[PDB]
Structures are given as structure tokens and as C-alpha cells.
Ligand binder design. Sequence first.
Ligand SMILES: O=C(N[C@H]1C[C@@H]1c1ccccc1)[C@@H]1CN(C(=O)c2ccc(C(=O)N3C[C@@H](C(=O)N[C@H]4C[C@@H]4c4ccccc4)[C@H](C(=O)N[C@H]4C[C@@H]4c4ccccc4)C3)cc2)C[C@H]1C(=O)N[C@H]1C[C@@H]1c1ccccc1
Ligand SMILES: O=C(N[C@H]1C[C@@H]1c1ccccc1)[C@@H]1CN(C(=O)c2ccc(C(=O)N3C[C@@H](C(=O)N[C@H]4C[C@@H]4c4ccccc4)[C@H](C(=O)N[C@H]4C[C@@H]4c4ccccc4)C3)cc2)C[C@H]1C(=O)N[C@H]1C[C@@H]1c1ccccc1
Ligand SMILES: *[C@@H]1O[C@H](CO)[C@@H](O[C@@H]2O[C@H](CO)[C@@H](O)[C@H](O)[C@H]2NC(C)=O)[C@H](O)[C@H]1NC(C)=O
Ligand SMILES: *[C@@H]1O[C@H](CO)[C@@H](O[C@@H]2O[C@H](CO)[C@@H](O)[C@H](O)[C@H]2NC(C)=O)[C@H](O)[C@H]1NC(C)=O
Ligand SMILES: *[C@@H]1O[C@H](CO)[C@@H](O)[C@H](O)[C@H]1NC(C)=O
Ligand SMILES: *[C@@H]1O[C@H](CO)[C@@H](O)[C@H](O)[C@H]1NC(C)=O
Ligand SMILES: *[C@@H]1O[C@H](CO)[C@@H](O)[C@H](O)[C@H]1NC(C)=O
Ligand SMILES: *[C@@H]1O[C@H](CO)[C@@H](O)[C@H](O)[C@H]1NC(C)=O
Ligand SMILES: *[C@@H]1O[C@H](CO)[C@@H](O)[C@H](O)[C@H]1NC(C)=O
Lengths: 546, 545
Amino acid sequence: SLSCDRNGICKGSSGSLNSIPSGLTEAVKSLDLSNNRITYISNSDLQRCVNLQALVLTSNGINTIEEDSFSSLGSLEHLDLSYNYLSNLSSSWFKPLSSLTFLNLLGNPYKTLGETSLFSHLTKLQILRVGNMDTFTKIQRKDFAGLTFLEELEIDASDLQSYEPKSLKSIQNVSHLILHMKQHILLLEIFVDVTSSVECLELRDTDLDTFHFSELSTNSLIKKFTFRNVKITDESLFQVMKLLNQISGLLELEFDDCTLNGVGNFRASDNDRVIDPGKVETLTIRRLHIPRFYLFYDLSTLYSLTERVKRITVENSKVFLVPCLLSQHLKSLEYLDLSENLMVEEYLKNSACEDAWPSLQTLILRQNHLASLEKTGETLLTLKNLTNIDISKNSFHSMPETCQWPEKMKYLNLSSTRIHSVTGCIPKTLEILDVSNNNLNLFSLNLPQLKELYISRNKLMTLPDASLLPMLLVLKISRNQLKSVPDGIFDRLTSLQKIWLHTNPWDCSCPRIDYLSRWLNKNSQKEQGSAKCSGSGKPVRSIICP
Amino acid sequence: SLSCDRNGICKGSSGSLNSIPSGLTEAVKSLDLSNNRITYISNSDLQRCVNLQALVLTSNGINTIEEDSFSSLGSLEHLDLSYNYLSNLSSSWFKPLSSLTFLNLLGNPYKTLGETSLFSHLTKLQILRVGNMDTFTKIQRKDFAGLTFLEELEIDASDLQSYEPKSLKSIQNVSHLILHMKQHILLLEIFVDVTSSVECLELRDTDLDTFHFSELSTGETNSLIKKFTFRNVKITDESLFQVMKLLNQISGLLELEFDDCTLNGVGNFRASDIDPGKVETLTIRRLHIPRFYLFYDLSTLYSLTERVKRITVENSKVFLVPCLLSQHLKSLEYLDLSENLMVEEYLKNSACEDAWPSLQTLILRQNHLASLEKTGETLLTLKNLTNIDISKNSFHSMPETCQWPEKMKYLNLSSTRIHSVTGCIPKTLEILDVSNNNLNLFSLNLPQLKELYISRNKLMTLPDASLLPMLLVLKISRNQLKSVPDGIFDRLTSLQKIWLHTNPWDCSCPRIDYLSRWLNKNSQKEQGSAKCSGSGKPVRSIICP
Ligand SMILES: O=C(N[C@H]1C[C@@H]1c1ccccc1)[C@@H]1CN(C(=O)c2ccc(C(=O)N3C[C@@H](C(=O)N[C@H]4C[C@@H]4c4ccccc4)[C@H](C(=O)N[C@H]4C[C@@H]4c4ccccc4)C3)cc2)C[C@H]1C(=O)N[C@H]1C[C@@H]1c1ccccc1
Ligand SMILES: O=C(N[C@H]1C[C@@H]1c1ccccc1)[C@@H]1CN(C(=O)c2ccc(C(=O)N3C[C@@H](C(=O)N[C@H]4C[C@@H]4c4ccccc4)[C@H](C(=O)N[C@H]4C[C@@H]4c4ccccc4)C3)cc2)C[C@H]1C(=O)N[C@H]1C[C@@H]1c1ccccc1
Ligand SMILES: *[C@@H]1O[C@H](CO)[C@@H](O[C@@H]2O[C@H](CO)[C@@H](O)[C@H](O)[C@H]2NC(C)=O)[C@H](O)[C@H]1NC(C)=O
Ligand SMILES: *[C@@H]1O[C@H](CO)[C@@H](O[C@@H]2O[C@H](CO)[C@@H](O)[C@H](O)[C@H]2NC(C)=O)[C@H](O)[C@H]1NC(C)=O
Ligand SMILES: *[C@@H]1O[C@H](CO)[C@@H](O)[C@H](O)[C@H]1NC(C)=O
Ligand SMILES: *[C@@H]1O[C@H](CO)[C@@H](O)[C@H](O)[C@H]1NC(C)=O
Ligand SMILES: *[C@@H]1O[C@H](CO)[C@@H](O)[C@H](O)[C@H]1NC(C)=O
Ligand SMILES: *[C@@H]1O[C@H](CO)[C@@H](O)[C@H](O)[C@H]1NC(C)=O
Ligand SMILES: *[C@@H]1O[C@H](CO)[C@@H](O)[C@H](O)[C@H]1NC(C)=O
């Protein structure tokens, strides 16, 4: 019915509640009545919850809340009324909430935030979420009256129809503004009011296929502009970039789950010259969709705009070519993440043409279609500054006796590559090596500089030799088939700080487990997790021998 | 060390041989002395083999051949002097060979065929090969004087410097002409002489990057060429339009093939201002794109495929077949995209509105396809698709129900890493291949199936024959079958071929009676020989009480 813990954290999980339970007291610290059938909130339901710090009523279907229902909740810090049936909000609900830090009103069918300012008394408010998908159609200038500083403001303006000018300009500082909006009609009229107050701007759900930029009635404080679930065409992209051109200090541009398509027979004619890269140094593209029946587009002229970009992530976005032309324009690129794409070694060699990627130090090709460890090593050889190489989750299966790798390489990730053994293919220059989640039985490579070895989720029968890994700081060797370890082994690793030994079938026979059980107790702070004995589920740490 | 036969077949087994044997026989019908160090040929080393029909001397060090050394060879049919050190050719060697059918002279460092016609008396010659990669630089008009009909003519003119006009116009019919030529300078001058005589033209090794078409005043558009093959040829996006112009001279061209060719850009070429002709089959194999290629855009050529019926683009780095192209492929009935990298999702872009209306056979073997369900759905809208080969793709598993083109009669799921089969396989099938997988059971109801290929699995029990009434073919070899249900084969009234070999058949007589008796009564049906597990003795060779 209503289950609490020893410290007043209460939750109503049954879902068969028709009203707020009776007999709530000053000992209730948190009240989670999510996903119940509560319909009414009277002035007496919560009068004795003077110590209530969090009140969650998500997805209940609350019709009405009496004016003074929250009169006693002066210590409430977290109020979630999202997804109920409140079509009319009263400023008297929030007047007593002097300690309120989080307020969520999303998903309630109000057309307006009322004719009286709701948040004038929330002097401590930090996170405000407001709006809905269907009926929220007006933003008024009074709506955000007494709010000067907010950490996060989320406005679901999905079907907003009108925006009263300067409604949002009253908020001086907003670290993160999230704006849902299916159409772009109101986009530029909201932008002028928040461009000077927002640090991280996020636009969600908007259809920008036919977006056109027009000069603004206006410097900007936005450092990051995120587009999520947004639709863009090759034509409207140049308009979007003109909007980004108004943000002189923009550092980071991010497209998550967006859609890119052609308008049909569009060409780059005069937009090419009038585009300034600005100070954008990080580009992040995730899960870019291209319509199933797409119209072809050619945005190769945009390759030349990347000369100053330092950090690029293009994840899970159907990349099977990175042309040499593009890679040669990427003169400042230090970090490239191409995870979850369709790159094959053959075309990766074109990407590494002469004078390609001079500054690149980190290359991530996790979960592409890479097949040969050798060809990959030779492909990356001409990238002289490459130090971090992640080629995990590629079905390599095996490695030859000897390989070529970039000379400065110090981090190599061979996780989830389906290998059954390791060879000298792995260079001695490595400081960090990950060979987790494979099918290794042995690891006996001489890596005199290796600081960190990750080798969990294998079939290791014996610990690697400590003489071969002198400088080891970290050894993650959990989830193997280790039964014992040579006595005195860990004193050999003078620099050892963290070690994972759990999920191994440790033999806890006293004439053998003595050293390990003792070492664990003296070094409990080094062990991550706790090694258990095979038969009994008792920690090896708490095993003493005569 | 010469192993000879009573039928006259002799061999030069040992490789360290210095000369042709002395005192030969009238009973020699063949002579293979390949990979020897023979250097000389006198008239007395082979004056007795008047019944000789073949003579092979490849990879020898023959420097000279005395005049009339072949005087006795009046019935010789096969002469191979390939890869020797002959730099001077005499017409008296081929004077006596009135019955010669095959003559190979490739690989010899002669600069020309000589001032005397060499093939004037070879009235029955069918296959002639001549030239080499280093020194052959001239073709005189008399080179091919007395040759009227030939089945194959291979000319390795890699370093051809000069070509006398009309040298090859004398030959009236050549079914297959193979021409090696590094340069294209003499390409057009040789084409006009052969276009009326050649049926299958093959051009090898030529660099056509800067080839420009210039029409000769022949006006003999009446060409005999039906197939034009380019092998190991380098073409650019610019010169490709010039090659098309050359192909335009061949009004009757049916087949165009590029094997191991290279396509690249010249840097900044744009297609703005073509007749497909009769070309109905296009073949592209192992097309290479240079490591540091120059980008090219030949999408304008998509519109030239509207009359092609057969297309093979194998192992040519295909990620995409855009909807525009597949909409233009109106006549295409057969598409082989084996050994490519077709992104599974935009396989669905290829099957857009009005795509591939005539396509009956689609081969996507050995791409990177991952989902059987997504593949079948992608192909559903291709109404005329009857043959689908998606073998050698790592599907791993299949769901309970799938959607496939309603007319599908042939499905190839070989080498697909499946451990079981479900009703995803549609009942319309007549041919199913699920070979080289990890199946333990096959019990689908396929009332129309006539051929089941299911070898290289782990079948412990025969597929339920009651569910395959129309089976003509059952290849169930290389499995784990130990026994068979009694009378199973009686129900298969239309059975014609069956593979049972390489199974651990338990030859315990109180158990194996039916199978051993059936195989004896139906010997002509078994392909291979079923062997007993214990002993390697045939199953049909054991009779039970
Ligand atoms: O816009 C682009 N990139 C920018 C956005 C990127 C970005 C920039 C900066 C920062 C961040 C990101 C891409 C750039 N850009 C081109 O340059 C381009 C231009 C024309 C053609 C074309 O039209 N071509 C016919 C090809 C051709 O010539 N075909 C005929 C020869 C064949 C034929 C015809 C008839 C019968 C038989 C055969 C041509 C081609 O493929 N050329 C070879 C050079 C290239 C290649 C292929 C394979 C491997 C290596 C090289 C190129 C193809 C590509 C296409 C764009 C593109 O990819 N558009 C999307 C629609 C594409 C897509 C769809 C689905 C999945 C994934 C992507
Ligand atoms: O944009 C790109 N990469 C940048 C984003 C990456 C990045 C990395 C790091 C930092 C910053 C950015 C990639 C670049 N790029 C292209 O250039 C390109 C696009 C399309 C085609 C095309 O049109 N082709 C028809 C094919 C073809 O012609 N097929 C027909 C010939 C065959 C056929 C089949 C059946 C019957 C008859 C004919 C062509 C192909 O696949 N293979 C051709 C080479 C071979 C061939 C064979 C035979 C004859 C001729 C040619 C290739 C060719 C090339 C595709 C993009 C790509 O791979 N994915 C893009 C969608 C991704 C994206 C976009 C925007 C933002 C983020 C991600
Ligand atoms: C929400 O509830 C309040 C509470 O009654 C409504 O308040 C009335 O608003 C009208 C405006 O036309 C005033 O004339 C009344 O005096 C108000 N009454 C009270 C008690 O405040 C308010 O109208 C409701 N909102 C909507 C949209 O109906
Ligand atoms: C199913 O597909 C496989 C290929 O995955 C076919 O097997 C090949 O058959 C051809 C005969 O045309 C041989 O030349 C190849 O050597 C075979 N390759 C392999 C890997 O076996 C098979 O024939 C198809 N099944 C049919 C057509 O019934
Ligand atoms: C708030 O915005 C003003 C506008 O200039 C800026 O000076 C100030 O640093 C910002 N404060 C925070 C905490 O971001
Ligand atoms: C490598 O990085 C350094 C920066 O430390 C830079 O100066 C140099 O140009 C880069 N290129 C090579 C080849 O080292
Ligand atoms: C190696 O890559 C995996 C993902 O495949 C990741 O989870 C792991 O943290 C990486 N190893 C490192 C960073 O040492
Ligand atoms: C080739 O041989 C014949 C006869 O041995 C001779 O007459 C002719 O001059 C020779 N040619 C050369 C170039 O030696
Ligand atoms: C299939 O092929 C037939 C030719 O027999 C053609 O008439 C029809 O339009 C094609 N497409 C279909 C049936 O969808």
C-alpha cells in the first residue's frame, strides 16, 4: 500500500490509490505516489508533512488541487506534477514553497500558465519544466516573472501558437534551455530573447526543412547548440548556419537523432562564400537518419569549413567513406570518433592520405566492419601523432606474429574482437591495453611500460607474469577461470593501485589461499569488488589460515 | 626418366633434362617435355614419329630448330613452343604440318613474325597464339597470310610500335580475338581491320586513361562483334565516354564486360552533352578504384541501362544502388551483386517505387546483410522476384514469420550461420539451400519443394519426408545421420538424386535393414557412397537376415 524505509522515504507502488493516503506525519521525508489513480488533493491531505522534501505525483490524473494544499510544505525541494489533468494552475500552490528547487509541470492540459505569475515566490528554484504536446499555445510576458537564475528550463512548446515578446528575456541566466517545438514559425522570435542568457541551447523535434533565416532585431552567451530529433534539408542547413552565425562564441554544435535530406536538385551557388566557421571547435553527430526514399544531396563544399574543428564525433550515422579531400581539410582535428559506422579498411587507407590528419591523436573505430588487425595497423601507420586507437567490437578473430603500429601509440583497445590468443603484434610501447571480452587462455606478453591491463571476461587459467608487467598500476582480471595466484606475485607490482579479482572460481583451500586471503585484508582498499570462494559464497578477504 | 604409355603418351618427368631423346619411335602419339632444359632440335631427334599428334615443349631453352625438323610431322595437331628463346622463326617448321590445329608461340623473344608468312599451309589451324610482352613490336601484312577461319587468335602485342594497315583484315572469321596492348596509339587502327571478322573481342592490359575516339573513314558500321571484353584496362571518367563512342561503332553489340579494370577521375570532369544500342548484358568484375583516387560522378550513365536484361557487378565495392538507377533498370531480369558491401537499410531505397519491375533473379551473396526479416521485407515489393540468393551472409537466426515475394521459388540460405529453421521460409519454395550451417533438425512443411540442399549440417534425423512430398533432390550428405525411419523413401515417389555419404551410419543389422536394402534397389539414385561408421565399408554391401 504505502511502503516507507527507516528514514521516511515512502512510495506507493500498488497503483490502486484513489487519493493521498491518510496519516502522513512529520516523519515523512519523501512521498512517491507515481502511477496511481489519485484525482483530488484537499487542503488537509498534506498539512502535517512539514518535513516533506520530495513529492512525486507523476501520471496520476489529478483534476484539482485546493488552494492551500501545500501550505505546510515549506521544506519541499522537489515537486513533480507531470502528466496529470491540471488544466488550470493557481499561484497559491507555489507561494508557500520557499525551498523549492525542482518543479515539473509537463504534460498537463493547460493552454496557458494562467493570468497570474506562478513562480514569483520560488526564490530557490533551479529546474523548471513546463508545457505540453497538444494544448499549450501561448507564452505570456508575465509567465516567468520572478525567475532571475535557472540551471535548467524545459519548455514543451510543441504546438505553441503565440509568443509574447520578451517573455523569456526577464530570466538573466539559464545554463540549459530545452525547447520542444514542432514548427519553426516562432523560433527566431524566441531566440532573440534567450540568446543573451543561455549557455547550452537545445532545440527538440522542430521541422526545419523549409526554415529561412531573417535578420534579427538585435553578443550571444550560447556556447553549445544542440539539435535533437530535428529535420534539416541541404537547402535549409545553410539557413541554420546563418542562425548559428549570430552566435559569435559558439564552441560546440551537436545533432542527435536528426534527419538530413535533399529538397531535390539543390546546388551550392552563393551560400558557399557567406559562411563563417567562427569558433566552433566540437562537432557531434549521433544517429543521423537519412530518409529511406531520400532525395540526393551534395554538401561536399562543407568539407572546407572544418579546418578549425578540434573534436568530431560522428556516431552511428551510416559512414562508409571519409574522403581524402575531407581528411586533408581536417587540419586541427585532434579527436575523431567514428563508432558504429560501416568503415572498411580499404577506404580507411584513402582517408589516411599524405598530409591527412596531422593533429589527430585519438581515433575511435569501435564497431565498424574492420576485419584484419594487420591491415588496420598498416592503414594507421602514416598518422604519426596517433596515440589512442580504439578498434574494439570489430571481428578480427586473430592477429599475426608481427604488426606495424603508429610509433607514439600508448593506448590500444582490442576489447570484443573474438581473439583466442595475443602475440607480439601488440607493441611494447603500450601503456594501456584492453583485451577484455575475448576468449584468451593465456597472457604472457612482455610490456615493460604497461600501466593498465584490462583483460576481464576471458578464460584465463593463470595470472600474467608480474615480471613482464613491472609498471602495472591497474589490473582488471575479473570474470576469468583463475583458481589461484602465485605467492608473492603482487609484491612484484610495486605501483599497483587497483585490481579486480571477483567472479573467479577461487580455490579457498587453506594450504594455498593463505597468501591471497592475507593480501586482500592488508590491501582491501586496492581490491575493486570482492573475490568470492567457489563452494561457499564467502569473500576470500575474510579467510584466515593456521 | 621418361614414363611412356603403350598408347604413345610420353612424359618428360624429371625437370633436369638437357635434350630431346635420341632414336625415337613410330608409336609416339604425344610428347610432353615441359619444364626441361632442352636447347636444340635436329631433324633426326623426331624423324620417326610420323604418327605424332601432339608436341608440348613449354618453358624450355630452345634456341634453334633446324630446318625440316618437323618434316615427319605430317599428322601433328598440337604444337606448343611457348616460353622458349626463339628470336628467329622459319617457315619450314610449319611447312609439313598440314593437319595442325593448335599452335602456341607466345613468350618467345622474337621482334617480328619474319619476312616469310609462317601459317600459309596450316589449312586446318583453329587456335593460334603469338607474341610476347617485351620485344614484339611490328605486325606486317603477311604475318597472317594463309589464315581464313580460326576459332581463337591471341596476339600478345604489349609493346606494339607499328601496325601495317590491313594486316588483320585478311582473316575472314575469328570467333575469339585476344589482344594484349599496353598503349592505345594503334588501338583504332587495329579495330577497323577486325571489327568485321571478330565475334568475341577481348582487349587486355591497355591504358585507356587518355583514349580519344576518332572515327576512321571506313563507314563499315556493319560489325560482327557481339561481345567486347576489357580485362585489366585502366579507364577514366573522361575516356569512358570515348570508349562508349568506340562501342557505338558496334551496332550489333550484345555483351559488355570489364574484368579487373580500373576506373578513376581525371580531376574536374562534368557530364553535360548517348545510344545504348543492343547491349543487353553488362558484366563488371573486381573493378578497382585507386587507393588515392580522383573523385568522379558518372550518375548520368544510370539512364543508359533501361534496356539491359542481365547485370553482374561482382566484388566492385558497391555500397549503394540508388533508387534513380534501379528505376532506370526497367528491363533488368537478373542482378548479381555478389561480394559487395550493400548497406542493408538502403537495400530498401533500391526497392523504391517502380524499381526493378522485371527483376526475377537477385543475388546478394556475401554482402554484409545481418537480418533475414529485414531482407525479406525489403524485397517484398519486387513482384516478379523468384530467385533470391543471400548465401554467405551472417544472419545467425530467423524469426517465426517473415514476408517474402509471393512468387519466390528459389531461396539460397547457404553458409548463413543458422542453427534452426522456422516458418520464415515460405511454402511457395521449390528449391531451398540451407547447406553449410549448424542445423540439427529440418521439419518444415513445404508442399512444393522439389530440391532440398542441406549438406554440411549437424542433422541427427532425416528431414520429415511426409512434409516434402514432391522432393526430386535431397542432398543430405556430411551430417550426423545414424539411421533412417523405415519406408521413408517409399513416399518420395518423384525422387531422382540423393546424397547420403559422409554420415556416421550405424551398420547394426537389426537396425539398418531398410536402408541397406533400399540403396541396393535404387543404386542409380545415390550420389556418392554411404559408408558404415565403424568400418569404411559401403552400406549397400551388407545384407541383413
Ligand atoms: O554531402 C556529402 N557530405 C557532406 C555531408 C557531409 C559532412 C560535411 C562536413 C561535415 C560533416 C559532414 C556527400 C558528398 N557527396 C559527393 O561528393 C557526391 C557527389 C555525387 C555523387 C554521385 O551521384 N555519384 C554517382 C557515382 C557513379 O558514378 N555511378 C556510376 C558509375 C556507375 C554506373 C552507372 C551505370 C551503370 C553501371 C555503373 C559516383 C561514384 O560512386 N564515384 C566513385 C568515386 C566514388 C567511390 C565509390 C566507392 C568507393 C570509393 C569511391 C558518385 C556521389 C557523391 C554526396 C554526399 C552524400 O553523401 N549525400 C547523401 C545521399 C548520400 C547517402 C545515401 C545513403 C547512404 C549514405 C549516404
Ligand atoms: O559524407 C561522408 N563522410 C563524412 C560524414 C563523414 C565524416 C567523417 C569524419 C569527420 C567528419 C565527417 C561520406 C562521403 N560519401 C560519398 O562521397 C558518396 C556518396 C554517395 C555515393 C553514390 O551515390 N554511390 C553510388 C554507388 C553506385 O554507383 N552503384 C552502382 C554502380 C553499381 C550498380 C549496381 C547495380 C546495377 C548497376 C550498377 C556507388 C558504389 O557504391 N560503388 C561504385 C564504386 C563502384 C562501381 C562499380 C561498377 C561500376 C562503377 C562503379 C557509390 C558515392 C560517394 C558518402 C558519405 C557516407 O559514407 N555517409 C554519409 C551519410 C553520412 C552522414 C552525412 C552527413 C552527416 C553525417 C553523416
Ligand atoms: C481557474 O480557477 C480560478 C479559481 O476560481 C478562476 O478564477 C476566476 O477567474 C475569473 C476571470 O473571468 C474571475 O472573474 C473570478 O473572480 C475568478 N475566481 C476566483 C475564485 O479566482 C479562473 O477563471 C480559472 N481559469 C479558467 C481559465 O477558467
Ligand atoms: C547456394 O549458394 C551457394 C553459394 O553460397 C552455391 O554454391 C556454389 O555453387 C557453385 C555452382 O554454381 C560452385 O561453382 C561454387 O564453388 C559453390 N560455392 C560454395 C561456397 O559452395 C550453391 O550452388 C547454391 N545452391 C543452389 C544453386 O541450389
Ligand atoms: C549570467 O549571464 C551574465 C551575462 O553577461 C554573465 O556575465 C554571467 O557570468 C552569467 N552567470 C553565470 C553563472 O553563468
Ligand atoms: C604532431 O603534433 C605536433 C604537436 O605536438 C605538431 O607540432 C606536429 O606538426 C604534428 N605532426 C607530426 C608529423 O608530428
Ligand atoms: C575499450 O572499449 C570498450 C568498448 O568496446 C570500453 O567499454 C572500454 O572502456 C575501453 N577500454 C578502455 C577505455 O580502457
Ligand atoms: C634467321 O635464320 C635464317 C636461317 O638460319 C637466316 O637466313 C636469317 O638471316 C636469320 N635471321 C637473323 C636475324 O639472324
Ligand atoms: C512483371 O513482368 C511482367 C512480364 O511478364 C510485366 O508485364 C509486369 O509489368 C512486371 N511487373 C509486375 C507483374 O509487377
